[PDB]
Design a protein around this nucleic acid. Structure first.
Length: 69
DNA sequence: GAGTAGTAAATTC
DNA sequence: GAATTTACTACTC
């Protein structure tokens, strides 16, 4: 069973979407307290409704959490 | 640990 | 000027 985004792609565990359609990636840090990461573009290729603050794709943020900073 | 819904505060075109 | 985003928790499995 694999959930998908508001389109037809495939989101991996840990990733998901809130009620605003924006993507949301929750992940328990080595502290024991869930962490919220928000974004609108799943990959640095999509766009973002005018009025929203530009940002890298959540995939670019996750990459930082996997590396170090 | 994974996810949702709801909120508290500050910010933007 | 108005509307909007971010962050954490509470409960759930």
């Amino acid at each position: 069973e694999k959930r998908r985004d508001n389109r037809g792609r495939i989101l991996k565990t840990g990733e998901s979407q809130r009620k605003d359609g924006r993507y949301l990636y929750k992940y328990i840090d080595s502290f024991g307290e869930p962490q919220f990461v928000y974004s609108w573009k799943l990959v640095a290729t999509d766009r973002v409704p005018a009025g929203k603050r530009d940002a890298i794709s959540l995939r670019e943020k996750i990459a930082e959490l996997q590396k170090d900073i």
